[PDB]
C-alpha cells in the first residue's frame, strides 16, 4: 500500500562547525526515487522538469512528497530542483542542498575530540503506512589530502532506517502514528597538529620556565619574578580563549592554563614560606633547591595523572 | 460562536542567546487544530496539502487564521507547511519554524543567572469572539546528557491561555476588543562551570597573590611591584570583557575586577604611607605586617557582603 | 479631494544601535485608516483580508497606498499584513514591521550622551493633494525595569505631521511637488552604569597611581617605573577601544586616556630634568616631593578645562 | 529612433566602507523618464502604478528597460517601485534602492586619504542605438553637521555620460556593440580627528619616551629597559591593527610602528656598542649623551622623508 | 542529436577569500548560446526577454537548460536575466552572477602561498548526449594597477571542457551518463608586502634582540630578563593570530614564533647552566660570550635549515 521511496544522498563537503550552537554545514545532493502512475511522455523518452516547472506539475496533481531534514536548523538553501518523469511510472526527484545541521557534540576532549556528523531525513506529512523508505545510499568523496582538513573521516557513511512513533497527534488504529526515518552518520576525528605545536607546546615551555624561578638567588628576585610569570599566564589565557573555539565547559588546554595559575600561586606560597620558616631568620635554602625539581616533577607527575 | 483552536507547540532547540538584544532562538513545530464545515474528501481518508498547495486552497476561500508570535523579532523562517483536511470538518495546520524571540532578561547576576525562554502566540486579526484558543500543549525533548549544554532546562514548560484588552483600537463594539493569547514559559539556568574555573578562580588567585606584595623587604621593591600587579588586572579585565557577554551593567565578575583595582590602589596608598607615617621617614615595619592579614581578611570581609 | 489617512504606530522594541552607521532597529506595528467607495461584503460585518489575499484585492482595483519609511535603511522585514474592509467604504491596513532606521546621532558625550530615535513616514507616490495624513497616534510601552535596559526612554513619543516640497520633478506646476509626512521622535539616554564603574573609575585610579611615581627615592626607580606605567595605559587603551563603540571622533573616555599618556609623559620630562636642573648637577630631591602634589593638582587643573 | 531615457539619482546616504573588498553602501532613489506612444488612462489625469502591479503591466506588454548598476556587488535591495504613466505618452519609473558598490580605493595615505564614491548605470540588454541616456541629474543632501560624520563629502557630485565598446559579441552590423553609460562621482575625505589624537599622538609620545632610555646611568638599566620598550611597541602594534581597518598593505601609521621597532632595536645596538667599544671596557659615555638627542633627531629625520 | 552550447564567462572581481572554509567570491556574467527550432519574432528583429518575462517563455515551452556551477556554495546571487531569441533559431541567455565558490587551497606557505581560483560549470539534468559544451571563452580585465589589490593574478584564465562519469547515478542505465563540464582556472599569488614588513620583519628584530640577553653581566639580569622576553613573544603570538587568517595548520610565520618560544627556553636553560657548570659555582663566562654568537648562528643554522 505505502509508496516505496529509494533515497540517495551525495555529500560534497562538511564544514563550518559551530561549537557553541553544536551545528555544522553540509553541501550535497539528495535523490529520491519512487514508482507511481504510468505516464505518456513526449517521444516516449523520459521527461525532464526543471525548477519552476516542478510547481506546475504539482498543480496538475503530481505527487511529490515533502521530505524534511529533521535535524536541520532553518530552511536549507535548495539550489536546482529536478523531476525525472519516466513513462513506466517511476519518478525521480533530484535536488542540491546546503543546510546547517544539528547533533550532540562533546568538545571536552578538545583538541583530541571525536565527532559524528549526522543527517536525519523523514517525510513531513505521510506516515509509514503511506510512505516508506526502501533503502538509503550515501556517497562521499574519499579525501586523502588529509592534513589540510581539520577532521579525519574514519569511514564511509553508516546508515540506519527505522520507524519513529509520534505519540501526540490525531491518530487511528495503532499504526498511523509511525514515520519512516533515514539516519546517516559520518564519524571523524580532529587533527590535533596545529593545536599541539602552537598552543600545547608553548604553554608547556612557559609553565616549565615558571619553575626556573626557584633558581634565582635573592628572595626579592624570586617573588617579584613570580608576578611577571603570573602576568604571562594571563596573557596566554587571553591568547588562547580569543582564537580557540568557545565552549560552555573546560577543555584540556583550559585546564593546563588553570594549572599554570596554580603552579605560580603555589610557588608564591612557597617562595614566601622558605623565607620565614626556620629560627634565627636563616635563609631556608634547604627548602628551596629541593623545590627546583619538586615542581618540575610534581607537575610533570601529578599532572600526568589526569587520565579521566 | 467563536471558533475553537487547539494549539500544540513542539520545542526542538533553544540557543543563540543575545545578551544585549535580550533575545534567543527557538526551533520547533507548531500545530493548530480547529473544526469547521464538513467536507467530502478523496476516498474518505484525510487529505494532505503541503506547502505551496496550501496557498491555493486559501485563495478558493479556505479559512486559515494567521496566528502570530507576539514576541518574535522579525518574520520567522517557516519550513514545511501542512494542512490535513479531515472529512468530518476538522482541519489541522502543522508547520516548522525557526525564529528569534524577545523577553526581559536579567543578567545582573551571572554566571549564576536564571532566565525563562518565553513564547507568546495570538491571532493577528480575529478577536476572542471570533477566534479562541481552547487549550495549549507543549512538548520538549529530554536532555539526558545536559552536562555538555550551555543551558540546563529545570522543569517542563508552563502554559497559560489568557485574554488581552487592546485599548487603542479603531472600531470598538464592547465585545470586539479582546484577543486570546497563549503564553509558554521554559525556566532555565546557565551552566556556570566554565566561568568558575577559567575566570572566577584565577581572578581569586591573582587577587590573592596581589596581597603578597607587602611581604617584600625594601620600599622600592614594594611600590614597583604594585605597578606590575596593576598591569595584571587591566590585562585580566581585557581578558574577561572580550570573551564574556557584553552587558549594560556590572556582573559578579565585573565587580570582582573593580575590587581588584581597589585592593591594589589601596595598597599603593598604604605602602607609600608607611614610608612617611612615623617620623624620620623610617620604614614603618610596625604598620606593615599588620596589613599582611588585614587585607586577606578585610577584603575577605567587606567584600564577603555583596548581596546587592 | 485629498484622502484622509489616520496613522497609528505601535512601538514594541527599539534596539541594535549602530554607532558608526548611526542607525537603530525598531520593531512595532503600523496602522493606516482611510475611507473610499462603499462595498458589498460577505454578510454585513467587516471583512478581513490577511497577507497573500491583499495582493489579489489590489488586482481587482482596490486602492492601497504605498506609505514609505523615509529614513529606513533597506527594505524592512514585514510580518503579517491585514486589510479590514468595512461595508461603509472605510479601510484599515494593519501590518507589523522591523527595520533599521537612520538619524543623526552625536556620540561625543559618551557614555553620557542623549539620543532621539526617529521614524519618518511618507507616501511614496501620492502627493498631499491626493493623500493627506489626518492625524498620528504613537503608542509606547511603559518601561518599568529600565535598569537592565541599555537605553532609558524619556517621555512618550512626539509626533509631527508636515509637508515637504520636492523641488526637482517633471510635471510639477507648483502644486504636485508637496508630500504629507508623519515624523515620530523618541528621546532616550544611555545607561552610564557599566561605563562608569568598569571604565571611568579604574582609569582614574590608574591615572591617580601614576602620580605615586614621585614618592620613589632613587632616580632609576622613578624612571624604570614610568615605562611600566606607559605600558599600562596602552594596555588600557586597547581594553577600551575594543569594547567601546567605534566612532570617528574622541569620546570622554578616549580623552582621559590621552590625558593619561600626557600625565605620564610629563612626569618623564620632569623626573629627567630634576637630575640635571640647578648647579652641581644635583639630584633635585628639593624639586621632587614638591612635585608629589603638583601633578595631583596640575592634572586636576589643566585637565579640568570643562571647555569642550 | 533610439529611445531617450532621462535619469535622476537621489543619494540619501553613503556608509559601510569595506576596506578589504573595496566597496561601500549607497542608499537612495533612482528615476528614469522616457516617452513613447500615447496611452489611455482612467481619466485624462496621469496613472500611478505601484510595486506588484508593475509586473502585471509588463505582462500585458509594457516596455520597462532593465537599467543595471555596473559597479554594484550583488543585486541591490529595491524598496518601493513606481510607474507614473502619463497620457501624452511619457513614462516615469521611480524606485528606491540600497546596494553595495565597488570601486578602486587607495588607503595608503590613511588616515588622511581621499576617495571618490562612484555609481555606474547602464542598460542591461539595449545598446546605444536602441536605448540612450539623454541626461543625468545627481542630487545630494546638505551636510551641515559633518563634524560627527566619518566621511566629509567635498563638493557636489560630478556626472558623466559615455559610451562603452564591447569587443566580444555575436550580432552582425558592427554598430550594435556600444552602450550608453551614466557615471557619477562623489569625492570625499576621511575625518582624521579620532586617529590623530588617539593613535598618532600617543605613538609619538611612546616613540619619544623610548629615547629617554639613554639618560639612564647604568648599562644594565639601559638594556633591560629597552626590552620593556620593545614590549610596548608590540602591544601598541596590536592595539592599532585590531582597531584600524585591515588592509593588504602598509599605511602611514604602520610605518611609524616599524620605525618604532627599529628605533628600539637601534638603541639596543648602541647601548651594547658603547659598553665594548673603547678598551679596558670603559663606558663610552661620549657615544651615549650624543645619543640623548641623536635619536630624537635621527628618527625625526629618517621618518621625515616618507614623501611617497 | 546533442545540443551545442557555447559558453562565455566574464569575470569582474574575485575577492573575499575565506581561509578556513577554503572559499572565495566571484562577481561576473555568464553567457550561453545554442540553436533550436526557428521562430517568428515581433518586428522580425531579435527579441529581448528580461527577468520575469523569461519565466513566461519557459511556460510556453521554451527550452532553457539549468546550467549549474558545480563548486559554488549555496544558491548564487543572480542579478539581471536576459534571453535573446533570434528568428533564425539561435538563442542567447545572458545573466550577471555573484557566488561563493569552493576549491582546495593550501595556505602552508603563507604569506608566500600560491592559489588558483576555480569555476566549474555543468548541466544539472541533461547529459552529454543531450547537451554538450562546444567551446568556452573566459574574459578577464588585463594587468592593471594590481599593487593595491590583495591578490595579483599571474596569467590569463585557463579553460578546459571535459566529461565526468558518475558511476553511481539515478537508475543504472549505462552510456546515458557522463556530463559536459567547463572548468576555468585562474592562478594568483598573495601580496606579501604587508606580511613581510609588519609581521616577518618585527619578529626578526624581536627574535634578534632576544639574543642580546647573553650580553647582560649578572645572572639575575639574564634570567629575569628572559621572563620579560617570554612575555614579549606571547604578546606577539596574540598580535599575529588575531590579525592573520585562522587556519587548521601551522604557517611559516607560525613556525617562526615556535622558534621564538624555543630560543628563549633554550636561553633560560643555558643562562642557568653556566651558573652551575664549573666547580665552586663560578659563573662560566667561558660558555657565555660564545653564546653571544652561538645563538645568532645556531638559530640561523640548526634551526634555520628550512630544507627538510
From Swiss-Prot, chains A, B, C, D, E:
Membrane-crossing residue ranges in chain numbering: 196-216, 225-245, 256-276, 293-308
Compartment annotation: Cell inner membrane
Cys-loop (motif): residue ranges: 106-114
Highest rank taxon of the organism: Bacteria
Membrane keyword on record: yes
InterPro entries listed in its UniProt record: Neur_chan_lig-bd (IPR006202), Neur_chan_lig-bd_sf (IPR036734), Neur_channel (IPR006201), Neuro-gated_channel_TM_sf (IPR036719), Neuro_actylchol_rec (IPR038050)
Cell inner membrane recorded as keyword: yes
Protein name per UniProt: Cys-loop ligand-gated ion channel
Organism: Dickeya chrysanthemi
